[PDB]
Each structure stands twice: as C-alpha cells, then as structure tokens.
Design a protein around this ligand. Structure first.
Ligand SMILES: [Br-]
Ligand SMILES: [Br-]
Ligand SMILES: [Br-]
Lengths: 81, 223, 213, 295, 122, 236, 230, 81
C-alpha cells in the first residue's frame, strides 16, 4: 500500500492497533570484582610545597573546560599583518 | 677514549661505517633517501627504518629496545623535512659485544649511536648537527665514575649510563642531551658529576670523530 | 624460546597444586580507547564471571565495496580460566550470527564494526563450561554496541539452561540463536521457558543500565 | 533411494579426415614453409606441439587445437557475464576466460537514453547502473593484445538480466550461431552465452517482438512482481535438462533443450532429473532420436 | 604601506585536537592548562586494588582452581592496568647484578587490533 | 688539505650579503637561520657575480635526488596511460616521462620505447613532495637535444661526485685516456650512471673495467696507467 | 518541530515510537501525518491479534525528535521521526553531499589523497570527529581529483600549487566511491585549504590572506594554495 | 615529564615543565621528555633523558627529580601495601 490509497478510517485503525500493541508490551548492580575500580571517573591531584597531594575538584575541571572553549571560540581576536 | 672507526666499507649501501671501542665492534649501514612502504610513509617527514642485530643468536626484544633508544637519538639529528614521503634504512650489526650481554647492553648501544651517526655522514643525509655517545659506569666500593668502562668493570658496577649529546659550532656547544639512559642505584649529586665529566669526554669524542670524518671523506672530494 | 616475548627459562615447569538465581553488575562506557565498551559481572553458586566487551567501529575497510557493514567478533582468554582457541572461535561464530540479525548493517556502508570480548576473570569455585558464559557475552556486546551508538533492531539477550543456550529478541517472540551441548532428551520446551526468563531479566537490567547510568 | 541416492565403492580411490592426436614435445612436421600457429613451437625446420590436442591445418597455418582450455573470447560473441569489480570509468566483468573482460562507461546505454544529456557525475555514480554481482548480456566488441575482451551493451538486446535464474555449462557445449536468445514453450526465454554462461528467464515483451519510461528502469534489481509458479517450475525443469545435456557432453542447442524439456515430462517430480541414470537416459534418448530422424 | 587584517578560522577543542595536536597543546598552555584539562604540574590520581584476583585473596576461603600468586588492578585517570603474577619451579645446578633475579612480564595493550606483538608491548 | 665543514657549524657568510643557497646549505623555515646540514668542502662564489653569491657544500654521496635541469640516465620500467614509469636509481622513487615529452609528439602516436630501454633525459620538474618528471626533448624548440634511447652498450654505476666531475670538469683525464685507447661514445648522468658503447664488445668491456677501477681509486694521476693495464689484459 | 503527545520521550533500541501514518481533526478538516523513518529509527513489521502492523521503532538509545519536511482534495504533512543519543562519528558517517575536514597525506600529478578527520553537521557550525587512528590507517581515506579542485579552469590545474602534505582541507563528498577512497571536491568558495603551516609543518602558522595565497604574520613568507574564501 | 617551548603566535586572551604526560596531543608534540624511577628513600633507580625538542636544562632535571620524589612518596604510602 501507499499514501493517498489509505483513508482516514484506515489510519485511525492503525493508530488503534498500535495503541493496543504498545500497551501490551508493558535490585541494584552492586560491584562483584571490577565494578568499583574500572568505571571510576578521572581524578587529578596537585602536590603542594609540603609534598602532600591535593585533590583537584571535578567542577573546577569542568569550569576549566568551558572557560577554554569560550576563550578559543569568541576570544579568537583579529590577526593584523 | 681510544676509539677507532672506518668509513665507507660497504659497496651496496648508500653509506656505512665500522665503530670500535675496546672490544665492542659494531658495523652500520645506511640507505636513503629511498622509496618507502605504504605503512612507513610519512606525508611531510622522512621515515626511519632502524634495525639492530645482536652478536650472538637472533634479534629478540632486547634489540627492540636498542632500536628504540637509537631512534630517540637519530630522529632529531636528521633534517627529516627535507625528505617527505621517503625512507631511510638504518641497520646495525653488532659484531662483538665487548660486555656480558646477559647483564649489560651499555657499550653496544653507545657504539651503535656513534656508528649510525658515522654511517649517516657517509651517506650524505641532511643532519641538523653532530653527535657523540659514551658509556659510563659507577663502581661498587670506590664509587668512582669511570668513562668507557671495561667488561670487568661493569661486573662490579652499581649503575650503568649511556650519554649521547648533540653538538654544534665546531663541536664546542652542547645543543641538547639526545639520550641519557641511567640504570641502577644513584643519587642527584652523582648524576650531575656524571653529566659534567660525561660532557667533557663526549666533546673529546666529537673532536676525534670530526678528525676521522675529514680524514676519510676529503680524499673523495676535489679541491 | 620466543623472540617476541619473555617466557623465562625453558627448564622451568609450571606450578601444579595438590589436593537469588543470579547476581549481576553492569557498567558501560569506561574505555576511551574505543567507541563502545561494557563491563558484565555475574555471581552465582560456585562460579563467578567478569568479562569486558569493546566495540571498535565503524572504521575503514579498504577492500572492494559493500552496501552494508561487516561485523567481526573475537573472544580472548583472560587471566584465570583458559579455553580452547577452537571453542572461542566457535562461540565467536555463534555470536556473529546473532548480531548479524540485530545490527542495522544498512546504515554503515564500506565500514567495519570489530567487537572484542575479553573473558578477563572467570573463576570456577566448584572446589564445556563455555555454555554458561555465552548469555553474558551477548549482554556485554549488546551493551557495548548500544553504548557505541550502533543501531540495533532490538535489545538482544539470552539465557542458559542445562547446556542449552538460546538468544531472544522481540519480547521473546522470536529466536536469534540456538545453542545446545550435552543436556538431556526432549527438554527443549523447558529450556526455552527458563532461558526466556533469564532473557527478560537481562533485558530489563540492560535497559535500566543504558538509561539511568 | 527414497531420500538420498548414495553410490558406494570399496578398495579404490575412484572408479577405474582422421584427427591426429599429439602430445607436448611431439614432432608434428619438418616442413619450414609452414606458418606456426597456436599450440605449437618451432626450431628451424622442426615444428613441435606445446599442448595435447589435434593437429589443425588451415591453408599454410599449422596449429594444434587443445583438447581442453578456458573459453577464448572472439570478436562479436554473445556472452553472459557477472560484474566482478567497478573502477574509474569502466567495469570488469567475469565471463569465464583467463582474464576479466572490460566494459567501458562509454560502451553502455545510460538510462533515459538518447534524450539524456551528458553528465560528469555518471563516472562517479557507476554503481547505480552496474554493481558487483550483477548479470548482463554483452557483445565482445573488440580484443586486446593478449586476447582479453572489451565488451559493449549498446543495444536493447543487451543489458542487465532479471526475472530468472542462472546456470552454467562448459563453453565447449555451446557454439556460435546467428542468435543465442531463444523462446521456448512454457513462456520462458533462454540466453545461451557462447562462454557457457546461461540465463533462463520469464519471456518478456522484447522476447516476443524479436520474432514478431522503460529506458529508466533498465538497471533495476527489481523483478517482475507477477511471476507464476508454472513459469518458475518451468525454469527449474529447463535448468535440470540443460545440466543433463551437459552431463552427457551433449552440445546445447535450442532444439535439444525443448526436445529434452518435453521428453523429461515422463517424470512427474522435477527433482527426479538430478539423478545420474535419468540424466544419462535423457541425453541418450536425444541422440537416438536424432539418429532415426536424420537417416 | 600594505596593512591587511585576517580573520583566524576557529575550531571546537575536540576538532582542533584532531586537526592539529601541536596547536591544541599550545592554545591550552597559553591559558596555564593542558589538553587533558590539567595544570602544568598536576598528576593523575591513582586507585588500586591488590590481591583481588589472587588465590590467596580470602585467607579463610583459598581458591583451589587458581594459580595467581598476586595481582593488582590499577586505574590512573582514564587508563586501566591489570597485573597478575603466576609462578613456576626450576631445578638449579655482594650487591653485584649477578645475584639478582627478575620477573618475566608479558604486557598487552588492547587497542582493538589483532596480530603479532607491537613494538610498544615488546 | 681542504676547508671542511660539519653540520651545526656556524655559517661563515654574513646575512648582510645576498646569498643563493645550493646543495648542503639549509634555511630553517622556523628560525630563518642559514645553517649547513651536510659534511664536506664549502664553496663560495666570488663577488661581482651579478651581485649574487652562490654558496654550497660539496659532499660525498651516491643516492641521487632529482633536481631541475639535470641530465640523467633512466631505464623504462613501466607504461602508464599518458607517461612512462622510469627508474633513475634502484630502490629510489620512480620518475615520470610523458608521451608528449618527445620530439614530433602527438596524441595519436605514442613513442616506441619499450620497458627495459635506457633513456638519456633532462629533469624538468623536481618537486620535493611530488613525483619528479623528466623529458626527452627541448621544451621550446621541440627538437631532441641529444636526448632519447641509448641503444645497446653497457651502463656503469658510479658515485654522484665522480659523475659530476665527469660531466662538468674538463680537466678530468678519464675521457682523454680512454680516447687514447679506442673510439667510444658516452652518455653521462648526474644520477650516477655512465653509458659506454664501442664497435666491439672487448673495447666496451675494457672501458667498463677502467671506469670502475678509476671510480674506486679516485686518484687522478693514475688513470692512464689503469687504462694501460686494462686494454693490455684484454689482448691476452 | 514538535511531536504529538502520544509519542514516547526517551527511547531504547527496540522501543515502539509511532505508526507509519497519523491523523487529526483541526478546523473541520482532517490533517494527514506521514511519518518517515529517520536516523535512529526503522520501519518494522510486527504481528498482533492476527493482523500485521508496521510501526516506527527506535534503533538507538536517546531522545525522540520530529520535524516537518517537504521537497477531490487532500492535505498531507510529512513528519521525520528520528532518535538522537542523549563526538560520535558513527551515526554521522560521510555521505554524498556532506562537507568534511580532511588532511592531505600524499600528492600526485593528477590527484590528492586525503584522510577524513571530521564531518560537518547541519545546524558556529558543529562537527563530528572521527575517533579512529591515523597511525594505523583506521581513518576513511579520500581522493580529490585535479578537476575537482576548483570551479574555473579545471583542465589546467597544478596539484603542487593547490595543496601540500599535511594541509587541512575542507571538502565536500561527491560519492562513496569504493571501499578504499571517498571522492571529494573543493570547487566552492568555502572549500579548500583551511589550516596549514609553512614548509609542510616545519614553519610557522599561515593564514588565508588571499583565496589563492597563504601568508605568515611572523615571517612574511607566503605560499600558493587553494584556500577557502576568508 | 615533558618540556615545551611556549609559541608566541599561539597565545589567547621560555620553557615549561609538564608532569605525567597524557592525551595524544602531548605524546605526539612533546619531544623533550624525562622518565624517572624514584625510590622513597631518596635515591633513583632509573633516569631517562630524551631531548629532541626544547633544550633539557639542569633546572628542568632538578625540578623533575624533585617531583619524582614527591610522587614516589605519595604512591608508596597511599595504599598501605
Ligand atoms: Br626470557
Ligand atoms: Br580472456
Ligand atoms: Br572555486
């Protein structure tokens, strides 16, 4: 079949049977071994003058990312020769 | 530092050499620039095919490391942008270890660097500068820094070092340190004392190399 | 011995020693090296399994031309339990047939989708075992493909019952793969029901993982 | 033999104007006047054979015709081939010879034909006309130095094949003729390529007009949406009898095919024609029929 | 006396990194950062898990069908490393190097390829 | 005794003087500095040469690198659609020789050169990042400037220095000492190839052996003696 | 650009979205909605209650978007149903007409061989970067023929003066070609060399001053390339 | 560790030492690198200097040796192994 060959009552029929089909189809994944270590997000550290490591915040890196993107796109400036 | 070298000993290669330090003898050959394989091709620069063959047995992962370190030295030496989409084959056949190969690969690496450089010179390939490599070791009790140590000295060493410097201005200015391969137990003070004495003997080596190069190549050229 | 690896001395001999229904864990997209990846861990009775899948594609195929994509699947032995290369090849072939019925290949002309499944940690704690790993492989590959962004007709899952493995799609109405080793006689109907129950559970957890995570 | 016919044998790996037969290295003649052709080689006066076959003498051209060998494309042959690869501005089609034949983009009829204006996008969209795997009619237009064939389809008679099934016989069983497309009872049409490649399809309007908007769909993979089972079962029967003629080393002609097709009607099920004894008898019945009809 | 202004074509960070890694590096360095969003002297953090794969993992319940003597699962940033130590036995017949042994490692860098050992791994 | 120079060494000439850079000398695209990259003798042309001094380094080499306006000896190793694939040296990148790069060329008639033929040609284009091109005619006049096929004879391998001296230096006694023994015609390629042909093979062979040995010794005041013992040894 | 309220918001592979056709009553006239399977969806024929049915099914994991597109009496509105994930070069594979960012790997006398690094997406514009490696030949390679370099004078074109090895060339796909090489073109004003350095990367940055000339602000030295119109 | 020269014609809005190289951009473009195996005791077991790019100065070496110690002290004591 094709468009225009199909009429409005035929369309509403299709919509009906679809609604019937669609409405007829209707525990945590805790780690076992490698679940805690592998999916672990990236963290970065900085070593102060004390020699002690310091945790770099995630949002700090996110903001650091979005700020560079704005400084690369909009702050492209104009090159004069 | 009484090394001995010969240049242009092979017939079917663009360039060759034979470097000898004590008992360590390495012969090297260089063909290039030539047509590269598709997987080797570099759009803008020269591709280096570097091969190291051992004195005994077949090439293993050991020589694969010798190829890698030798690559770190030769790569910045060659003006690669002069030969885009081109190949330069560099083969080193270590003829005599001059050391216990089961324990050390120090003298073989330095001799390969010096030989490869000489072979590149013979082949007439664009080089940004000159280069010299020496092996260094630190003995157990005395803790003295011995430049160009013997095999017997290596057996009683606490650390072994390969130093290769990049020279310019008639072999007087150290442009950079191409390779420093320090292995074993050592402290920061020992490191710079090593680098200070190492630079001196390296500079002496370049001067000797410059002599060897001119002595061999000048008869070929015209006045 | 080998000139490409360090296998040690030849006179050396390996050390020989003397004498709910399922618990799942799913994670996706932890391998930046590829396009899609999945971690599937299962724990039950006296056997736990931790396998990792990785999808590389669609990438270039420099040979002739194809209107659709070409799938390749390779299973690798992990650290602990080893399997025959033949047996890993056989499962690979069985998996290729399954995902050639699910992956919308029409959307990837002259492209290659290489799927790797690493049998990283398979512990046998009983103080052809490969049949019990098959449903977990399909789960990992399905997760990885969906994580990669490769089009799938439906969430392909599977189940195992008495050496019989059967993978379902379309709410368990149809079968995309049938596997049977050992087992008993005239036990087909019982296996289909038990596997469909596992298929349904795995599919729910997969969708839950692809959405919430 | 209700389900499978299995012939068995033990203790053996297998079952175990005169035409002058010569073998490689054999001396054919010692007359230096001769012009040495194919299958031969010479040294001064001596002419030797390079292959195993029969000595042929045409005028002053001595050659040895081999007993075996692949199809050798002659200029003007009607062949059936499959597109092996597509590149630049040409296709390479599998005919069944030593080398793939070439089919230049300028040697085919583009869709829409004479009305179509030339486009430089055709050379980049050749896969929309002929792609890998497609079957087609073609005529050997020219020959290359080595012997390779250049094909062309500059005709309505030639072009992409559809509405049927493919089968092949040794090229030796099909010779050159005035025409290789034939209409047969059952509303089916055969295309007997000289290369041995045969195409059996449902008879089209063109096939009827041969003895008695469409130019846009000359490269469509789509078949006739209305093909009866009686035509399909006819194709299968024609296929089997052709294979039967080939099994008996019988030269395939349009008469031999129709004769075998009607003679095979003795057997109810078409699948009975795949058995050895059936094939051998059908071919044997054709030879004997030509015996008592000829004399 | 020919003054001309040029509008430099800009690209997204991900595109620039693919197009020109060298330029992408220098752009980041001008803002005191790196393409990996870290600062000049910032290291990647490290997370490990020891002896989780070894047969001696649980002292109370030692595995019987396991030959792993020691193990370590390490993740630093986005890279994951899994190490397992197995053993063998061979009959035998100062601070010098001749009195020291070593382990025989086989490293595999999974990069979605199949074939011989790479020069990296060797 | 000569004035040797090494890579990385300071360049003698001052930037205040306009200098045309030849072989051996490299101008860094990044730092704009002029520095030697080859090892050998530095040659600087005298001042007054149209206000432009040409500086280059004569260095030992045997691997040829195509440069414009060079006479070379190539061998046809392939036939493409519009040109020949020709090798100037083993293992080197192939060069192209157009079918239209001949005297009396036409789009209807291709040259009769077959694969395996030797050709004496001139390098017309030699882009660094592109396949070099050679031609077997004069681009302006259209005639053959001595270019074309080299029928028969024998070809000789020779280092680039020896070939350059044989082609440009008239004080090189080699061609003279060979003429004192026999009649011969010779083609000289800057790619280190020398073509020699006489009426008899024994003479061509004698020439081959002399050129080989003279290239090996590189002692000018010994060519006459080498040719003497060579042509003598053939007579035995 | 708005889907009906009867449509699902989120989607996973295998989830039903909508029938092939829809309709409604507005202003005393029946409007016909023609739903077209877009990227991330596919028409799948299911069975239920004995009667067959073809419905739009999501093949990806993400959100569902719709957009109207067109190119007795009756009115029909054509709606495009697709699923967008939510970087991925996968779903946006280079097709005929697409603009791509390529890198010249080898120049020849008659053509220019490149590798596709990124593909332009449809509404600064957005991009989809290929995660493949250029070291293992994992990237889709392409070819820019000499006659497809520029629009004017396509007969006499020197490749060495249009592109250089390492250049980043913005090109448009002509055809898929074979499995080895795509076929691209740069015969437009906004096509050609976009990013380049002097002496094949051995020099400083060069910007497109002229459409046929690239210059360096620092050195002043210029090079001849087929640049995109600044 | 890695050493790079800041290119004046790449600034937005003279060498720099970079620690723990990651990303393709750093592995591909940084040719002057330093690798260290440092024992928490204070001594060193491995020291690789590869200067193909910027010049490796004694200051760069000393700073690298310092950071290697600080990093080693962190890794050794962190997981109480
Ligand atoms: Br070993
Ligand atoms: Br043929
Ligand atoms: Br244009």
């Amino acid at each position: 079949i094709l468009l225009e060959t199909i009429s409005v009552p035929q369309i509403r029929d299709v919509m009906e049977r679809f609604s019937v089909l669609c409405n007829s189809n209707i525990v945590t994944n805790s780690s076992i071994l490698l679940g805690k270590i592998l999916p672990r997000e990236e963290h970065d550290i900085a070593y102060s003058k004390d020699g002690l490591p310091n945790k770099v915040k995630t949002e700090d890196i996110r903001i650091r990312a979005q700020n560079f993107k704005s400084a690369l796109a909009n702050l492209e400036d104009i090159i004069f020769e | 530092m009484s090394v001995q070298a010969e240049i242009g000993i092979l017939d079917h290669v663009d360039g060759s050499s034979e470097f000898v330090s004590q008992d360590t003898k390495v012969i090297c050959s260089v063909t290039g620039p030539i047509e590269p394989k598709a997987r080797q091709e570099l759009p803008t620069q020269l591709a280096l095919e570097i091969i190291v063959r051992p004195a005994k047995g077949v090439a293993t992962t050991r020589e694969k490391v010798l190829e890698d370190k030798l690559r770190a030295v030769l790569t910045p030496l060659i003006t690669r942008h002069c030969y885009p989409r081109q190949l330069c084959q560099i083969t080193c056949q270590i003829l005599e270890s001059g050391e216990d190969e089961a324990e050390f690969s120090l003298r073989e690496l330095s001799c390969c660097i010096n030989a490869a450089f000489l072979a590149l010179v013979d082949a007439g390939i664009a080089l940004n500068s000159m280069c010299a490599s020496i092996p260094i070791a630190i003995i157990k009790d005395t803790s003295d820094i011995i430049v160009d140590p013997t095999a017997e000295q290596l057996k009683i060493s606490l650390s072994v070092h390969t130093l290769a410097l990049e020279f310019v201005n008639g072999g007087k200015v150290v442009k950079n340190v191409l390779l420093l391969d320090s292995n074993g137990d050592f402290n920061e003070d020992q490191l710079f004392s090593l680098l200070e004495l190492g630079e001196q003997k390296c500079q002496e080596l370049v001067t000797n190399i410059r002599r060897i190069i001119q002595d061999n190549i000048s008869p070929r050229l015209v006045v | 011995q080998d000139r490409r690896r360090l296998l040690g001395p030849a006179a050396a001999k390996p050390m020989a020693f003397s004498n709910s229904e399922q618990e799942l864990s799913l994670h996706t997209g932890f391998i930046e090296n590829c396009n899609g990846s999945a971690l599937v861990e299962a724990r039950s009775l006296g056997h736990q399994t931790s396998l990792i899948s990785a999808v590389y594609g669609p990438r270039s195929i420099r040979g002739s031309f194809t209107s659709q994509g070409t799938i390749s699947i390779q299973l690798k032995n992990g650290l602990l339990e080893k399997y025959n290369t033949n047996e890993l090849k056989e499962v690979s072939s069985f998996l290729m047939g399954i995902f050639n019925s699910v992956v919308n290949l029409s959307r990837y002309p002259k492209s290659g989708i290489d799927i790797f499944v690493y049998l990283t940690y398979d512990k046998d704690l009983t103080n052809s075992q490969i049949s019990s790993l098959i449903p977990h492989c399909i789960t990992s590959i399905t997760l990885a493909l969906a994580d990669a962004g490769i089009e799938l007709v439906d969430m392909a899952g599977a189940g195992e019952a008495n050496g019989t493995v059967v993978s379902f799609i379309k709410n368990g109405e149809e079968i995309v793969g049938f596997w049977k080793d050992d087992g008993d006689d005239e036990d087909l109907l019982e296996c289909l029901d038990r596997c469909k129950e596992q298929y349904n559970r795995y599919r729910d957890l997969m969708i839950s993982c692809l959405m919430n995570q | 033999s209700e389900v499978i016919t299995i012939t068995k044998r033990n203790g053996a790996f297998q079952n175990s104007s005169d035409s002058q037969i010569v073998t490689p290295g054999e001396l054919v003649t010692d007359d230096p006047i001769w012009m040495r052709g194919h299958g031969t080689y010479f040294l001064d006066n001596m002419t030797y054979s390079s292959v195993a076959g029969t000595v042929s003498r045409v005028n002053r051209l001595l050659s040895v015709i081999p007993l075996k060998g692949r199809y050798a494309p002659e200029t003007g042959d009607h062949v059936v081939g499959r597109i092996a690869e597509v590149g630049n501005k040409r296709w390479k089609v599998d005919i069944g010879g030593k080398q793939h034949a070439v089919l230049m983009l300028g040697s085919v009829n583009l869709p829409g034909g004479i009305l179509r204006r030339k486009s430089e996008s055709d050379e980049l969209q050749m896969r929309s006309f002929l792609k890998e795997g497609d079957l087609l009619n073609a005529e050997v237009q020219s020959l290359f130095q080595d012997g390779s064939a250049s094909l062309h389809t500059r005709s309505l008679k030639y072009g992409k094949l559809r509405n049927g099934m493919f089968c092949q016989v040794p090229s030796s069983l099909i010779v050159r003729a005035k025409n290789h497309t034939h209409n047969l009872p059952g509303n089916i049409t055969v295309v007997l390529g000289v290369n041995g490649y045969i195409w059996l399809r449902k008879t089209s309007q063109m096939d009827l007009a041969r003895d008695t908007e469409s130019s846009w769909q000359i490269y469509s993979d789509e078949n006739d949406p209305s093909i009866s089972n009686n035509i399909r079962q006819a194709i299968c029967r024609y296929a089997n009898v052709i294979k039967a003629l080939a099994f008996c080393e019988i030269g395939i002609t349009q008469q031999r095919i129709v004769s075998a097709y009607e003679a095979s009607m003795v057997y109810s099920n078409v699948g009975e024609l795949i058995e050895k004894n059936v094939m051998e008898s059908i071919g044997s019945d054709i030879l004997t029929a030509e015996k008592m009809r000829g004399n | 006396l020919e003054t001309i202004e040029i509008h430099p074509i800009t690209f997204p960070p991900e595109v620039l990194a693919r197009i020109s890694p060298e330029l992408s590096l220098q752009r980041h360095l001008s803002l005191g950062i790196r393409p990996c969003l870290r600062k000049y002297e910032e290291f990647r953090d490290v997370a490990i898990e020891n002896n989780t794969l070894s047969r001696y993992a649980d002292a109370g319940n030692i595995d019987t069908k396991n030959n792993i003597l020691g193990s370590n699962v390490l993740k630093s940033g986005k890279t994951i490393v899994i190490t397992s130590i197995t053993g063998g036995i061979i009959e035998e017949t100062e601070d010098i190097i001749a009195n020291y042994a070593s382990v025989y490692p086989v490293v595999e860098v999974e990069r979605g390829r199949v074939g011989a050992c790479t020069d990296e791994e060797m | 005794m000569s004035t040797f120079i090494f890579p990385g060494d300071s360049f003698p000439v001052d930037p205040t003087t306009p200098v045309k850079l030849g072989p051996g000398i490299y101008c860094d695209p990044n730092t704009q500095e002029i520095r030697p990259v080859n090892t050998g003798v530095l040659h600087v042309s005298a001042k007054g040469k149209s206000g432009v001094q040409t500086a280059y380094i004569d260095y030992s080499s045997k691997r040829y690198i195509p440069s414009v306006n060079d006479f070379v000896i190539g061998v046809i190793i392939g036939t493409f659609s519009d040109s020949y694939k020709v090798s100037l040296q083993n293992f080197s990148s192939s060069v192209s020789l157009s079918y239209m790069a001949f005297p009396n060329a036409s789009k209807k008639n291709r040259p009769t050169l077959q694969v395996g033929d030797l050709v004496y040609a001139r390098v017309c284009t030699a882009e660094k990042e592109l396949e070099a091109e050679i031609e077997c005619f004069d681009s302006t006049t259209g005639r053959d400037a001595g270019f074309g096929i080299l029928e028969d004879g024998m070809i000789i391998d020779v280092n680039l220095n020896f070939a350059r001296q044989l082609l440009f230096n008239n004080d090189f006694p080699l061609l003279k000492v060979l003429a004192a023994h026999t009649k011969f015609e010779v083609a000289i390629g800057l790619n280190g190839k020398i073509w020699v042909k006489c009426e008899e093979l024994s003479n061509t062979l004698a020439c081959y052996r002399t050129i080989m040995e003279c290239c090996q010794k590189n002692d000018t005041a010994a060519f006459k003696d080498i040719a003497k013992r060579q042509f003598k040894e053939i007579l035995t | 650009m708005a889907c009906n309220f009867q449509f699902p918001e989120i989607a996973y592979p295998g989830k039903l979205i909508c029938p092939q056709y829809g309709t409604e009553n507005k202003d005393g006239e029946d409007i016909i909605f023609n739903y077209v399977p877009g990227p991330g969806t596919k028409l799948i024929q299911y069975e239920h209650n004995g009667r067959t049915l073809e419905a739009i099914t999501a093949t990806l994991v993400g959100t569902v978007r719709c957009e109207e597109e067109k190119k007795t009496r009756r009115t029909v509105k054509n709606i495009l149903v697709s699923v967008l994930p939510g970087n991925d070069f996968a779903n946006n594979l280079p097709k005929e007409g697409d603009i791509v960012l390529t890198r010249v790997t080898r120049l020849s006398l008659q053509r220019a061989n490149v590798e596709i690094l990124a593909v332009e997406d449809k509404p600064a514009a957005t991009f989809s970067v290929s995660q493949a490696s250029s070291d293992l030949g994992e990237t889709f390679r392409g070819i820019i023929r000499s006659q497809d370099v520029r629009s004017t004078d396509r007969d006499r074109v020197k490749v060495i003066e249009c592109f250089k090895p390492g250049d980043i060339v913005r090109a448009q796909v002509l055809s898929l070609g074979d499995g080895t090489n795509y076929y691209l073109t740069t015969a437009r004003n906004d096509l050609g060399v976009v990013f380049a350095r002097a002496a094949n990367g051995a020099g400083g940055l060069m910007y497109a001053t002229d459409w046929q000339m690239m210059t360096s602000p620092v050195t002043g030295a210029t090079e001849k390339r087929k640049c995109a119109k600044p | 560790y890695g050493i790079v020269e800041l290119d004046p014609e790449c600034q937005l809005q003279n060498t720099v030492l970079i620690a723990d190289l990651d990303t393709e951009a750093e592995e591909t473009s940084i040719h002057s690198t330093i690798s260290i195996l440092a024992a928490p005791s204070g001594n060193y077991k491995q020291l690789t200097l590869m200067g193909g790019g910027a010049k490796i100065t004694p200051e760069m070496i000393k700073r690298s040796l310092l950071l290697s110690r600080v990093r080693a002290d962190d890794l050794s004591t962190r997981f109480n192994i």
